[PDB]
Amino acid sequence: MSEESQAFQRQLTALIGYDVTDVSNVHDDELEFTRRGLVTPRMAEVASRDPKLYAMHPWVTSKPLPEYLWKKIANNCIFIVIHRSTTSQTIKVSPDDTPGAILQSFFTKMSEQDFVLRVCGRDEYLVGETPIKNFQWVRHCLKNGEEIHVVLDTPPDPALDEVRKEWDCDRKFRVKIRGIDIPVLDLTVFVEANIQHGQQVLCQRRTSPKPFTEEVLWNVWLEFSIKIKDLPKGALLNLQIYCVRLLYYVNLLLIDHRFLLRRGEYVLHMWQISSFNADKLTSATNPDKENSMSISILLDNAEMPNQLRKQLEAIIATDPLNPLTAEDKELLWHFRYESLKHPKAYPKLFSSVKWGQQEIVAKTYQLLARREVWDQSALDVGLTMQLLDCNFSDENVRAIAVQKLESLEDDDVLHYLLQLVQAVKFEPYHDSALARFLLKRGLRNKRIGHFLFWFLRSEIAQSRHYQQRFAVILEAYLRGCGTAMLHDFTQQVQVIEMLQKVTLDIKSLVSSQVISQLKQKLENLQNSQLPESFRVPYDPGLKAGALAIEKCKVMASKKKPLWLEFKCADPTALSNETIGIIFKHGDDLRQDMLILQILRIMESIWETESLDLCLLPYGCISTGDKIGMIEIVKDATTIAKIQQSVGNTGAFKDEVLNHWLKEKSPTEEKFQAAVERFVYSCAGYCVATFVLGIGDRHNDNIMITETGNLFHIDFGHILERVPFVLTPDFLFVMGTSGKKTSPHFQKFQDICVKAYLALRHHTNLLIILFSMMLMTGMPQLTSKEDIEYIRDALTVGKNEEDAKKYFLDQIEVCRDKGWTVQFNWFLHL
């Protein structure tokens, strides 16, 4: 169209944070070609969308209600409190009761159906043909022993979710290196050209060294061994510059999105370094044409023996990080069809394919066509993710992984959403099955869409390597989510943008001269700019309204984070506490997202085995670059603020925590409950942090609720080693003093092992989330050793006895250290 269309595209660009129509930094039309290609998948999903359920986005699981939540249901009954204007009942319900059956048990008890059950204060709906025990909110209240308060009102209008309608010979490969050109510059340099496929180097030619000047020309043809015929789809031409150190890199797809051999002149602006990270794989070029180093090039082109079957089974049995010897690869490949029967063998098997051989690749495709076994295998996420990491560039291979993800219920997609989004950094092409899966699942569920938005926007705002790709995916999604969401997103984006300017102008300018500037700026923004209401990005069901200027402060700390507090915009809120949101800058919150999300994954893992370690993965979302927001946990203090209250330099007292708990819990019952919550949470976080290798933390980065719930914060990181924090003040709450035993220190040791072995049951899953996390989220170019940590931490190989020993050993290391490490953080300061 015109003024309205162009304004709609302007609408999107503002939401995205990047102009998808911009073509300044491309050398082909892949991005555009991807924008067009994504239209069909979008429209199909939109055209299959059930309006009523999409508008009400019920949050549901199929998983059996955990044992520890069953025990919290006495007479096979669950009480619900319905509200009408000023009305309240309390219908006893069966855990197997459908919502519709309950309203039926309501209007009989005391347009008829024109009503629906909405959670009080929240934008959450308990609807659809689902046992009332299988709603997430209902499982939430149960865990927190809360009353399920539900207001009865009218179903939301599906009209609000309306959508605004719209080569190749037998010649060997060769590349011409013209030269390099950097405006501004140990004094020698050479260009290395790698043919890469799935992180593997198929062939590698180098140039002669030359003096390192602002303009170095070679004008040389690099001849490779591999013929043009044997180039696999997805092969990257990896161009790098060494001085013996790696300075710059850039990649070019040898085969494009149209299956055309890429030929012609290219001047590629490179990224500079400052070895396994995902950024090294990007096909995008550096946008900063002014300063970036440039590169110029020209393209112009029976039965299986018993002992061997046991060899194979052994190989297949090893963990992902276990390297395959050439001997192992030949065995796996030669016995393709026997390996095919073992879904767990796939990752290794396809790591055994010579991708530089067209004939081998074809045989491989003939293997995948023998779908049966794979297709009928039970969904194994851990295994599936392995096929979607950096070791796999082949479309067909990666596609069968995605195919397996299709059978994930929404609840499960949420658990892995952040990782799957990140996993797009490993796709050779912009338009991939993985991208479409995310897009498809985002448009089908509002809650998944919401988090898809922020996960994508998070990367677009701070990752120049992938922002272009993520923007095209984000736009596609935005064009199908409906108007209601486009409007809500618009508010959230504005709020965070206004709260940005504020948190920025404060760090520069804790005095009351700032307490004055703060309250003055908030009042100004509130009176005029800040929207009436907006959704909490890390808790979308919750609507935050007006500001409580009186409550808003500015935390004292290295960085100057804003501590805000909003009034809920929902009148039917069965409470009147404010929403506390922290707005921080100066730290990349993405790493924290990844950690918190692996934390939630750990909880579910523990749920599949009827365990609850009371972790507390608070809300945390990167909203722009270097900034973001963090949920404020009510009734919570830092472990340090409780100690440094006897407040001194160093000097920790063993029973200040206990005093604090007792002081904060009114009854010996509520206190004893807090002491139990502490035992669990403490165990949960000791295991969780040991496994992830982030256990050695210090006081002020560990918090506790007044209900005795422990939880770590700020996985910045922020500034003798200890496996994890288990200080004498923790132990004292458990009754033990260095060193003996108590009913609760025995419970602790028990839980830890139960939880630890539980995690080890899913070794492969964690291993692969760990390695991915590091490759897509962590600063450093991670080496093989960093990742090899999870192997060791999970005692790979060893039995459940040697393992239990290993961990209880760790527990003792901490006990022997006491306050040593904590005291050191001061001493060193």
Ligand X SMILES: CN1CCN(c2ccnc3c2c(/C=C2\Oc4cc(O)cc(O)c4C2=O)cn3C)CC1
Q: How many CB atoms lie within 10 A of CB 780?
A: 10
Task: Please state the closest distance from residue 603 (CB atom) to ligand X, in A.
Answer: 16
Q: Does 514 bind ligand X (CB under 6 A)?
A: no
Q: Does 631 bind ligand X (CB under 6 A)?
A: yes
Tokens standing for 376? 């009928």
Residue among 428, 561, 723, 818 that touches ligand X (CB under 6 A): 561
Task: Please state the closest distance from residue 636 (CB atom) to ligand X, in A.
Answer: 4
CA dist., res. 651 & res. 644, Å (int): 9
Tokens standing for 592? 């924290």
Residue among 182, 620, 661, 775 that touches ligand X (CB under 6 A): 620
Task: Please state the closest distance from residue 579 (CB atom) to ligand X, in A.
Answer: 12
Residue 53: exposure state from Cβ atoms within 10 A (0-12, 13-18, ≥19):
middle
DSSP string, 647-703: -SSS---TTHHHHHHHHH-SSHHHHHHHHHHHHHHHHHHHHHHHHHT-----GGGEE
Task: Please state the closest distance from residue 136 (CB atom) to ligand X, in A.
Answer: 21
Residue among 353, 421, 630, 814 that touches ligand X (CB under 6 A): 630
Q: Which of 315, 319, 313 is nearest to 329 (CA)?
A: 315
Our CB check for ligand X shows the closer of 625 and 714 to be 714
Q: Does 719 bind ligand X (CB under 6 A)?
A: no
Secondary structure element (H or E) that encloses residue 600, with its range:
helix 590-607
Task: Please state the closest distance from residue 537 (CB atom) to ligand X, in A.
Answer: 15
Q: Which stretch binds ligand X (CB under 6 A): 220-228, 355-363, 515-523, 630-638?
A: 630-638
Local structure of 718: helix, strand or coil = coil
Q: Does 555 bind ligand X (CB under 6 A)?
A: yes
Q: Does 638 bind ligand X (CB under 6 A)?
A: yes
Q: Does 715 bind ligand X (CB under 6 A)?
A: yes
Strand ranges inside 158-263, DSSP E: 172-181, 188-197, 200-206, 210-211, 215-227, 236-242, 246-253
CA dist., res. 702 & res. 716, Å (int): 13
Secondary structure element (H or E) that encloses residue 566, with its range:
strand 562-568
Q: Does 582 appear as a known binding residue? A: yes
Q: How far is CA 663 from CA 341, 670, 674, 770, in A?
A: 61, 11, 11, 40
Q: Does 584 bind ligand X (CB under 6 A)?
A: yes
Q: Cβ neighbours of residue 797 under 8 Å, at least 6 residues apart?
A: none
Task: Please state the closest distance from residue 641 (CB atom) to ligand X, in A.
Answer: 6
Q: Which stretch binds ligand X (CB under 6 A): 56-64, 75-83, 226-234, 582-590?
A: 582-590
The binding track of 586-605 with respect to ligand X, each residue x by CB under 6 A or -, is -x----x-------------
Number of amino acids touching ligand X (CB under 6 A):
18
Our CB check for ligand X shows the closer of 439 and 594 to be 594
Residue among 120, 582, 613, 775 that touches ligand X (CB under 6 A): 582
CA dist., res. 807 & res. 121, Å (int): 44
CA dist., res. 198 & res. 361, Å (int): 14
Residue among 43, 321, 498, 636 that touches ligand X (CB under 6 A): 636
Site for ligand X in 644-683 (CB under 6 A): none
Q: Does 713 bind ligand X (CB under 6 A)?
A: yes
Q: Does 714 appear as a known binding residue? A: yes
CA dist., res. 525 & res. 507, Å (int): 18
Our CB check for ligand X shows the closer of 574 and 694 to be 694
Our CB check for ligand X shows the closer of 356 and 777 to be 777
Q: Does 632 bind ligand X (CB under 6 A)?
A: yes
Q: Which stretch binds ligand X (CB under 6 A): 256-264, 487-495, 709-717, 803-811?
A: 709-717
Our CB check for ligand X shows the closer of 295 and 582 to be 582
Residue 179: phi and psi, rounded to 5, are 170, -175
CA dist., res. 739 & res. 99, Å (int): 54
Return the HEC string of 321-351.
Answer: CCCCCHHHHHHHHHCHHHHCCCHHHHHHHHC
Task: Please state the closest distance from residue 370 (CB atom) to ligand X, in A.
Answer: 46
Our CB check for ligand X shows the closer of 641 and 659 to be 641
Sign for the pseudo-dihedral over CA of 818, 820, 821, 824: positive
Task: Please state the closest distance from residue 804 (CB atom) to ligand X, in A.
Answer: 31
Whether the CB-CB separation of 696 and 724 falls below 8 Å is answered with yes
Q: Does 716 appear as a known binding residue? A: yes
Task: Please state the closest distance from residue 715 (CB atom) to ligand X, in A.
Answer: 5
Q: Does 565 bind ligand X (CB under 6 A)?
A: no
Q: Does 704 bind ligand X (CB under 6 A)?
A: no
Q: Does 315 appear as a known binding residue? A: no
Secondary structure element (H or E) that encloses residue 772, with its range:
helix 763-777
Q: Which stretch binds ligand X (CB under 6 A): 23-31, 33-41, 627-635, 760-768?
A: 627-635
Q: Does 478 appear as a known binding residue? A: no
Residue 433: exposure state from Cβ atoms within 10 A (0-12, 13-18, ≥19):
buried
Measured from each CB, the residue nearest to ligand X is 592
Task: Please state the closest distance from residue 25 (CB atom) to ligand X, in A.
Answer: 32
Q: Does 48 appear as a known binding residue? A: no
Site for ligand X in 417-476 (CB under 6 A): none
Q: How many CB atoms lie within 10 A of CB 434?
A: 20
Site for ligand X in 26-85 (CB under 6 A): none
- Bridge partner residues of 705 (DSSP): 636
| Residues within the interface to ligand X (CB under 6 A) | 555, 561, 582, 584, 587, 592, 618, 620, 630-633, 636, 638, 641, 713-715
| Residues contributing to the annotated binding site | 580-589, 615-623, 711-719
- List binding-site positions for ATP: 580-589, 615-623, 711-719
